[PDB]
C-alpha cells in the first residue's frame, strides 16, 4: 500500500459516506410507497434520487474529473443502475431478504420491489446477487473500490478515450489487489479479487435485464408517465 493507494481508499470512503444515507431520510420527499405497478412512482423516485448520489460519488473518484464530460456521461449512463444495486447491499439484510432503510415505511422486500413493472426475471437474480455479496463479507474499503471500478470501466459503450479509462481502472484494480493482499485476512483473501470481478459480471447481466424490461415498460405511456425526467434522460425515452 503506497501513499497514493492509501489516498485513493480514504477519498473513496469519504465520497461514499457523503453520498449514501441508509436511513434514507429524503425518501419522505418521494411519492409515497403503496396493482402490480403501485410501487413504480415511489421506486422511480428512489432510483432518480440514487442516480444523483452515484454522480456525487463518481465525481470524487481520483482521475474521473480528468476525463472529458462526454466520457463521464457515458460511464454514468451505463453504470448508474449497477452502482445503485451494488451500494444497496449495505441496507440489505438476509434476516428477511429486504432493504431496510430504518423504518417499516421504507423497508422494501420481494413483494414491494416486484410492484414496479419489473418481473422476477430481474428481481430474483437481484436478491440472489445481494445474498452472494453479503456472503463475501467485503471490507467497506473493498466495497467503495468495487463501486469505482464498476463506474470507470473502459469496456462500456460510447467510451472515447478507453486508454485513459483503463489507466484509471488499473490504478483502482492495483489498489484493490494490494489492499486484499496487505489487509484482507487469508484465507478470506483467496481469489477474493476474482469473486469481486464476477460480482461486476453479475451487475452487467442485471443491467442488461433491467434495460430489456425498461425498454418494454417505457414503451407504454401510462408507465413512462410515472417515471422522472432524469430517469428518462439516463435510461432512455
Amino acid at each position: 500500500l503506497s501513499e497514493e493507494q492509501q489516498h485513493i481508499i480514504a477519498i473513496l470512503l469519504d465520497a461514499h459516506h457523503k453520498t449514501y444515507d441508509p436511513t434514507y431520510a429524503d425518501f419522505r420527499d418521494f411519492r409515497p410507497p403503496v396493482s402490480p405497478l403501485s410501487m413504480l412512482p415511489h421506486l422511480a423516485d428512489l432510483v432518480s434520487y440514487s442516480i444523483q448520489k452515484v454522480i456525487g460519488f463518481a465525481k470524487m473518484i481520483p482521475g474521473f474529473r480528468d476525463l472529458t464530460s462526454d466520457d463521464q456521461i457515458v460511464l454514468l449512463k451505463s453504470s448508474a443502475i449497477e452502482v445503485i444495486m451494488l451500494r444497496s447491499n449495505q441496507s440489505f439484510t438476509m434476516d428477511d431478504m429486504s432493504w431496510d432503510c430504518g423504518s417499516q415505511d421504507y423497508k422494501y422486500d420481494v413483494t414491494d420491489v416486484s410492484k414496479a413493472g419489473h418481473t422476477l426475471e430481474l428481481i430474483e437474480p437481484l436478491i440472489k446477487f445481494q445474498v452472494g455479496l453479503k456472503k463475501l463479507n467485503l471490507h467497506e474499503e473493498e466495497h467503495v473500490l468495487l463501486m469505482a471500478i464498476c463506474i470507470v470501466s473502459p469496456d462500456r459503450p460510447g467510451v472515447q478515450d478507453a486508454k485513459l479509462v483503463e489507466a484509471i481502472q488499473d490504478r483502482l484494480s492495483n489498489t484493490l489487489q494490494t489492499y486484499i493482499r496487505c489487509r484482507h485476512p487469508p484465507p478470506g483473501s483467496h481469489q477474493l479479487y476474482a469473486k469481486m470481478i464476477q460480482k461486476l459480471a453479475d451487475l452487467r447481466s442485471l443491467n442488461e435485464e433491467h434495460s430489456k424490461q425498461y425498454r418494454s415498460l417505457s414503451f407504454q405511456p401510462e408507465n413512462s408517465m410515472k417515471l422522472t425526467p432524469l430517469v428518462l434522460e439516463v435510461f432512455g425515452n
Partner: peptide
Amino acid sequence: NHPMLMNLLK
C-alpha cells in the same frame, strides 16, 4: 443529449 446529467456533473 444529456442536459440534466451535464448539470449534475458541473
